[PDB]
Write a protein that binds this ligand. Structure first.
Ligand SMILES: *C/C=C1/C(=C/c2[nH]c(/C=C3[NH+]=C(/C=C4\NC(=O)C(C=C)=C4C)C(C)=C\3CCC(=O)O)c(CCC(=O)O)c2C)NC(=O)[C@H]1C
Ligand SMILES: *C/C=C1/C(=C/c2[nH]c(/C=C3[NH+]=C(/C=C4\NC(=O)C(C=C)=C4C)C(C)=C\3CCC(=O)O)c(CCC(=O)O)c2C)NC(=O)[C@H]1C
Lengths: 310, 308
């Protein structure tokens, strides 16, 4: 008390965070469910899109891009996709990401933030970040370089490299932060801070962001997968509404924006790049992707160093 | 030292798929490519001595001043460019670099395509996974060649490793069934002479989308600081040795791109890409190919086996 930790079904909250929209599609692209904010940011209104083809809802270019993406052999758990609608109004572009799960195709839409951000310049800077990281030659220094790069690209107040021990307790082994915030370097945390069902989720889905912990959830309606007759599994949805217990925990330490990226050493959860901001901090899909690439390169380095000996 | 002698860094010309402008440190226009009127409606004659502010829009001028002002590294970076002009305004995909006391801008008209080229992140994520699963140098190079071919669509992608005498061997390859294999062939050092090699050690990417291009003169071809021809070593548009052009014409490949594989300071090898037809490589693509080369070189280093 609390020892009910592992029991919360965090993957089926029936709701998302309000900063994007979510549509759930059948394989033939009929809309089966949608976030209740679909009228505002866009159409009008769920009961109105339900049963319509997503293809009569978005762009001709978007439908083509999605058909290409979904035909691409080798699963992948989805990817970015540029999305546009034209409506009675009414022409909007979104940063989309799709994914397949639970026998549905999900489309999440985020309005493009930060306001350019020339992508060619951003790719070049990502390459340079990767170069600095790959030049580190010890575990702490690779971890510190990783935290510095992520901090640089995301502007987060405090970026921490959290390493799991064999019992899933953990320690902050590297950190880059603004001098105004507290250091967590060297601090140890028990396993129950990230309970077993979260660790499972974070092994299969390596990126999460909660830009404002004080958000009001938006329901997904109907919250019923027609393929299962049960609530829709939002495990792979970037917009998934998270456990209220975690949000209380964040409020408790005074950080209203958070993101973390799993560091996967093979198929195993080695640690996290954990990021805290004092106020809300929205991070574009492109920047989240750069942070994922950083964790991927860092994981590879960690493995090479682990194979050293002997 | 005979194939060594061609002054490849000073051709006084570029390839016609972009334009080049050269600016003094105070941003006045020093020189530009003769296709300015065709691509922009403005003449070089009307541009020499004029300020960058007086020529590009304010947002471009800002981006560029900020990029150049950034302290520390970078020979250069990508930049989005628009022109001020009475006839209106045109957007270009830009890079700048600094070299020989000049600042260069290279600009290409924006991509217009019926096709859907692949995305930087997905392509790099997938390439690292594959490289990482590899357990030998040869398999790591083959994964690199296969990823670069997938990203680019090139008919043949080869990993060319230099020996200590700077001869070379194609140690991995991916190709379409329609073109011959070069896998396991050795080539003499003369195929990439000493001055090209030195260039390719400091400037790691080269692209010749159409080897039968009509070179476009840079005017004036005279650096005001230096009284010598404009040094285009870091220009991605530089017009390339016509000897190397004929070398490709002779093997029927009309589009090429290569990326250096660098091991610290040493030119270790090339990712060499051949296409039968001209091949204009998407800008996101060339960056992904560059990152593949950097991660491969790291991996080659690891397999070399530690910390000096
Ligand atoms: C009994 C329930 C508890 C609990 C539940 C819980 N916690 C999470 C998710 C996270 N917990 C995190 C822990 C840390 N962040 C840090 O910075 C550090 C130390 C440096 C630790 C130990 C992290 C990073 C997450 C991921 C989310 C994020 O990045 O902010 C969940 C799952 C939330 C969700 O995905 O729905 C749950 C159920 N935490 C507890 O302390 C006890 C009371
Ligand atoms: C005496 C002059 C000769 C000569 C000159 C030359 N060659 C280059 C540049 C390249 N040569 C290349 C060689 C290969 N490409 C391949 O695929 C293979 C086989 C696997 C080989 C040996 C390459 C890759 C380049 C870089 C350009 C590219 O990627 O297409 C230059 C310099 C061109 C320039 O940068 O201006 C010169 C002067 N080559 C000869 O064979 C003799 C006759």
């Amino acid at each position: 008390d609390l020892s009910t930790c592992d029991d919360e079904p965090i993957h089926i909250p029936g709701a998302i965070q309000p900063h994007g929209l979510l549509l759930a599609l059948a394989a033939d692209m009929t809309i089966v469910a949608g976030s209740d904010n679909l009228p505002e940011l866009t159409g009008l209104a769920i009961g109105a899109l339900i049963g319509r083809s997503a293809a009569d809802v978005f762009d001709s270019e978007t439908h083509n891009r999605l058909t290409i993406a979904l035909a691409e052999p080798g699963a992948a758990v989805g990817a970015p996709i540029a999305v546009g609608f034209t409506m009675p109004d009414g022409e909007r572009a979104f940063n989309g990401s799709w994914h397949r799960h639970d026998q549905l195709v999900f489309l999440e839409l985020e309005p493009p933030q930060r306001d350019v951000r020339y992508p060619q310049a951003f790719f070049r800077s990502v390459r340079s970040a990767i170069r600095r990281l790959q030049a580190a030659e010890t575990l702490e220094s690779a971890c510190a370089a990783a935290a510095q790069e992520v901090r640089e690209i995301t502007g987060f107040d405090r970026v921490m490299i959290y390493r799991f021990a064999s019992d899933f307790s953990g320690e902050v082994i590297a950190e880059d932060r603004c001098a105004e915030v507290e250091s967590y370097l060297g601090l140890h945390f028990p396993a129950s801070d990230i309970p077993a069902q979260a660790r499972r989720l974070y092994t299969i889905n390596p990126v999460r962001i909660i830009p404002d912990i004080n958000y009001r959830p938006v329901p997904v309606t109907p919250d019923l997968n027609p393929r299962t007759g049960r609530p829709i599994d939002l495990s792979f949805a970037i917009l998934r509404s998270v456990s209220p217990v975690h949000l209380e925990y964040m409020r408790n330490i005074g950080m209203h924006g958070t993101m973390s990226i799993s560091i996967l050493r093979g198929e195993r959860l080695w640690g996290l790049i954990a990021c805290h901001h004092r106020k809300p901090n929205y991070v574009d899909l492109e920047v989240r992707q750069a942070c994922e690439l950083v964790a991927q390169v860092l994981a590879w380095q960690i493995g090479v160093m682990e194979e050293q000996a002997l």
